Amino acid sequence: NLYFQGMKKEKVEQILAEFQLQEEDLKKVMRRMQKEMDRGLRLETHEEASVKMLPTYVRSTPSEVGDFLSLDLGGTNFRVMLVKVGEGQWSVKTKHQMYSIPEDAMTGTAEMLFDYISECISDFLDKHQMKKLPLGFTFSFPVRHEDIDKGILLNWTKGFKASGAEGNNVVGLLRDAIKRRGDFEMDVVAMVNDTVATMISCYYEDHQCEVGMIVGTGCNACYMEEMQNVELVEGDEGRMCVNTEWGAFGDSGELDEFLLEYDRLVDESSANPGQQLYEKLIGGKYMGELVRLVLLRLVDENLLFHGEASEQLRTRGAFETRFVSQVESDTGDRKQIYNILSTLGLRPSTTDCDIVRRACESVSTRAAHMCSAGLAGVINRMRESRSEDVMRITVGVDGSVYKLHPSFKERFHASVRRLTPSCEITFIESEEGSGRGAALVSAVACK
Numbered sequence: 001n002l003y004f005q006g007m008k009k010e011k012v013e014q015i016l017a018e019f020q021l022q023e024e025d026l027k028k029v030m031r032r033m034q035k036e037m038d039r040g041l042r043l044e045t046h047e048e049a050s051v052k053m054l055p056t057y058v059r060s061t062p063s064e065v066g067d068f069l070s071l072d073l074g075g076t077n078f079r080v081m082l083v084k085v086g087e088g089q090w091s092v093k094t095k096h097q098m099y100s101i102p103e104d105a106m107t108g109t110a111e112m113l114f115d116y117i118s119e120c121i122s123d124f125l126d127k128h129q130m131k132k133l134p135l136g137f138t139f140s141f142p143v144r145h146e147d148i149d150k151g152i153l154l155n156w157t158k159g160f161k162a163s164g165a166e167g168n169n170v171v172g173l174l175r176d177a178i179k180r181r182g183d184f185e186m187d188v189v190a191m192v193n194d195t196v197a198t199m200i201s202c203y204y205e206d207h208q209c210e211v212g213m214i215v216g217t218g219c220n221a222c223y224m225e226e227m228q229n230v231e232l233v234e235g236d237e238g239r240m241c242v243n244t245e246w247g248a249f250g251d252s253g254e255l256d257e258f259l260l261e262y263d264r265l266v267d268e269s270s271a272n273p274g275q276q277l278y279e280k281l282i283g284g285k286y287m288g289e290l291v292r293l294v295l296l297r298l299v300d301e302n303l304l305f306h307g308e309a310s311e312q313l314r315t316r317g318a319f320e321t322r323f324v325s326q327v328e329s330d331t332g333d334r335k336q337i338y339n340i341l342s343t344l345g346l347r348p349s350t351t352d353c354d355i356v357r358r359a360c361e362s363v364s365t366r367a368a369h370m371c372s373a374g375l376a377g378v379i380n381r382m383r384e385s386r387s388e389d390v391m392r393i394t395v396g397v398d399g400s401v402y403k404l405h406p407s408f409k410e411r412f413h414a415s416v417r418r419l420t421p422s423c424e425i426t427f428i429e430s431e432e433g434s435g436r437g438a439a440l441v442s443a444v445a446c447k
């Protein structure tokens, strides 16, 4: 019966309705987010604020030229690259290599981690016969800076758990590991978040870019704040980039009304339970798993796969986030959806496929909408801080979710636009943002 297939589909929709957020829900999240950003900037409230609004010491009024080395650590892969900076300043990726980080190095000791990093740097300097450049470190974790070249790791995020790194100077850890190996020498001149790197890389082609955003494994944003509002740094003149660390929004209960069973389960099986909760609604580290967990509930309610979940479907992380993009790239014939579930040991019908799509759309739309509330909060804050009825601003964006998901981008922009009246927001995707941004920040600091 088509009548019974449609009754299965109606029941799924009732369950999936839970992922909906009304426009007023988003405005509420936005206001709460703006409130947390206020708190993180102020001396009185900074320690308790879950959105830490960390000074980066990358300023509005900041350079050198020549060969630069860029390091990038934040995802499953560590990337090294040679970049040429020339006359403002252009930058170009000329040599590049990425390395897979062994499990033991992400979850072992800091020494292991940075030993592996240094090994990677020497292989790269080998593969290009260049083993003393100025070195920029894109390091995508919450860091409390004392300057551009010095700051301590507040805490690991995104599954990182190397011991002996939290509360230590990250540049120091890198310098130490390089010294231990002692077969090359590098001038470590700057450390930057990936958001900051992305923002800076978009500046040569568009000077209106004063916001950087990452929607990848993790989710975070930075922006050019007025120095007068950055209470943690001395001076009131011009602007300084702030790393919001908005992923930890929710860690003090601010999203509790909105968290679902699937979110609690994802948080509980994560490396950092109770932390990075806003990020866990959005990031690619967690999105596919969120979908896997919806699909499991649906098989349990007898609405999917004849009520039977395969060994693969019951394994953690098996529904990869790229599968969410692929499913939602489907043209209507169900071929992409079928092949994904086939490789998961499942024997999907035609309606099974349509339900999996609906599950993915519900998770990724919520991610798009939740993300939109955070960005709209930042851009609205900036408009009010500045002196204009209409703010024109560019946002530099990187990450596989924003970049590769076929509809996230579009759902996200629309929602951001609803929430930012009297703002004209241009979105640009960075091209090698982290390498070129890191190199560009190095060249300034190279003084």
Ligand SMILES: Nc1ncnc2c1ncn2[C@@H]1O[C@H](COP(=O)(O)OP(=O)(O)NP(=O)(O)O)[C@@H](O)[C@H]1O
Binding pocket: 074, 075, 140, 158, 194, 214, 215, 216, 217, 218, 219, 283, 284, 285, 286, 320, 321, 322, 323, 325, 398, 399, 400, 401, 404, 405
């Ligand atoms: N085609 C895809 N569509 C959506 N997500 C994907 C896709 N391919 C990989 N991913 C996910 O995106 C993440 C990797 O994205 P990527 O942008 O390369 O990392 P990243 O930007 O370093 N993350 P982060 O450092 O947390 O900002 C992983 O969690 C993957 O599961």
Ligand SMILES: OC[C@H]1O[C@@H](O)[C@H](O)[C@@H](O)[C@@H]1O
Binding pocket: 074, 139, 140, 141, 142, 157, 158, 193, 194, 195, 214, 216, 217, 218, 219, 220, 221, 245, 247, 276, 279
């Ligand atoms: O890589 C994207 C983001 O992931 C977050 O989890 C990290 O804490 C941020 O520093 C980073 O900007």
Ligand SMILES: [K+]
Binding pocket: 227, 228, 229, 230, 231, 232, 233, 234, 235, 236
């Ligand atoms: K100040």
Ligand SMILES: [Mg+2]
Binding pocket: 074, 075, 140, 194, 214, 216, 434
């Ligand atoms: Mg990154």
